[PDB]
From Swiss-Prot, chain B:
It comes from Homo sapiens (Human). The keyword Transport applies. The gene is GRIA2. It is linked to Neurodevelopmental disorder with language impairment and behavioral abnormalities: A neurodevelopmental disorder characterized by global developmental delay, impaired intellectual development, poor or absent speech, and behavioral abnormalities, such as autism spectrum disorder, repetitive behaviors, and hyperactivity. Some patients develop seizures and manifest developmental regression. L-glutamate binds at residues 86, 88, 93, 139-140, 190. The chain holds residues 414 to 794 of 883 of the full protein. This is Glutamate receptor 2. Residues 117-258 are extracellular. It is found in: Cell membrane; Postsynaptic cell membrane; Postsynaptic density membrane.
Length: 259, 258
């Protein structure tokens, strides 16, 4: 048995630095939903592990030119990590190079506005020019728009791909900050999970509006044909059935809500 | 080789067409899972035959003989090649068959006759005037059997001992029992089926409260099936094209009559 290298990402409330992290070591430096989940998955599958934050701070995309995978997906593909336990979206292009468990959390793409912004829907955003809108610059949300053949979303993509200055952001935090500082003139397209979390954080000035644009999930990912895939999947099923995943969601989203 | 698909008559997933008696083979049926089977078959490049599960059950394991019934049994014993049905992904099933990523989300929910003074599972568990039960041989019954959550444990104790029986052989039977019991029977069933019935004449039932859990239906194949991989990728593709969302609207709400 060797220590399992876990790749993950600093994304609230999934993985965060503990206030006193400088005084702590190894796994104890972090907290959050995915930190709690990693401990349970390791316990139920019988392995020791080490949490590592993804070097480039990215989720995972393949460069169209170089064909190289970046982010957490890259760490799995190139053998730098053994498992990714993070809000990593299950997608077809990813499933072709890595394996995912059954989804441990559901989510869909959603709209974040600064409160009072006169927008209620994706259709609203597409039919106007006063309010800019964008996505995380690398990730499944961007690809959803890039690939969509649905009229409303294709229209949004045509706008976003050509908008100047860029409407895309490097991190979720950057997108949230941009909504907060843009006096209602920027809306952010991000996953419902992160949207709902931020909605419950001070200064309580953002809101999720409209229905979700799609319906998907986060999965625990392992390299193709990993020895861990089967047991990890069974552990996700057990934890779902025992209500732990619901308990953890409540713990990190709503029990700690500031609004 | 023509792929034998096991499925179950459960609205709006698989239903006999109005004019079924004059039709043959797959053409006799319509519904969400009929459309899904056609899509999966197209994207995986196979011919197939839809067959309705012989015993009318989803699938559970006999505690004594360890024999599986239902669609799960058909896969386990080699009577069918794939199940395309509202079949809930569960740990005990994943141990004997393979599931695709979930093509639809659902949770256990409460169906009441309109006007029944019940708003939650907790409400049901606190009283005795209104009886309540679940489908037999399915994942909802097992949920209550295995739950340690106090409210659900309390409900199970009541349900397992209730006389006359509160359990039903089919969803349709549960729905009929709610409709005819003058508000004195509430039915525990998956949110998907509950929300469908809520939009059907005579428009006398309602879903109340939040869902009791969060899970999904998956396409199932026998362990080590050569079809498992391709079918999973097909589900991902259909999801990403918005086709699953299209089919959900087509069968739930475009056909809504309330
Ligand atoms: C048995 C449970 C562990 S579960 O496996 O039911 N998970 C519960 C959460 C959940 C259920 C259904 C869906 C629907 C979308 N499916 S998806 O794979 O995200 C898409 C990429 C095809 C998403 C997330
Ligand atoms: N969960 C996404 C990142 C966030 C987003 O794209 O909105 C992914 O795995 O790429
Ligand atoms: N979908 C369930 C059947 C219906 C129910 O138990 O509510 C199963 O696969 O067992
Ligand atoms: Zn545990
Ligand atoms: Zn198709
Ligand atoms: Zn028996």
């Amino acid at each position: 048995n060797k220590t399992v290298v876990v790749t993950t990402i600093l994304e609230s409330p999934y993985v965060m630095m503990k206030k006193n992290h400088e005084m702590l070591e190894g796994n104890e430096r972090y907290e959050g939903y995915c930190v709690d989940l990693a401990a349970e998955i390791a316990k139920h599958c019988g392995f020791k592990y080490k949490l590592t934050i993804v070097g480039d701070g990215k989720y995972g995309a393949r460069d169209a030119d170089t064909k190289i995978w970046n982010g957490m997906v890259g760490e799995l593909v190139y053998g730098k990590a053994d498992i990714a336990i993070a809000p990593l979206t299950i997608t077809l292009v990813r499933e072709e190079v890595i394996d995912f468990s059954k989804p441990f959390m559901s989510l869909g793409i959603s709209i974040m506005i600064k409160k009072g912004t006169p927008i209620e829907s994706a259709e609203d955003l597409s039919k106007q020019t006063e309010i800019a809108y964008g996505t995380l610059d690398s990730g499944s949300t961007k690809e959803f728009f890039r690939r969509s053949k649905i009229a409303v979303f294709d229209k949004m993509w045509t706008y976003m791909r050509s908008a100047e200055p860029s409407v895309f952001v490097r991190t979720t935090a950057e997108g949230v900050a941009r909504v907060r500082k843009s006096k209602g003139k920027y809306a952010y397209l991000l996953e419902s999970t992160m949207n709902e979390y931020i909605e419950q954080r001070k200064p309580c000035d953002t809101m999720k509006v409209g229905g979700n644009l799609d319906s998907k999930g986060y999965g625990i990912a392992t390299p193709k044909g990993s020895s861990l895939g089967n047991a990890v999947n069974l552990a996700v099923l057990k934890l779902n059935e025992q209500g732990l995943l619901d308990k953890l969601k409540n713990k990190w989203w709503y029990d700690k809500g500031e609004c």
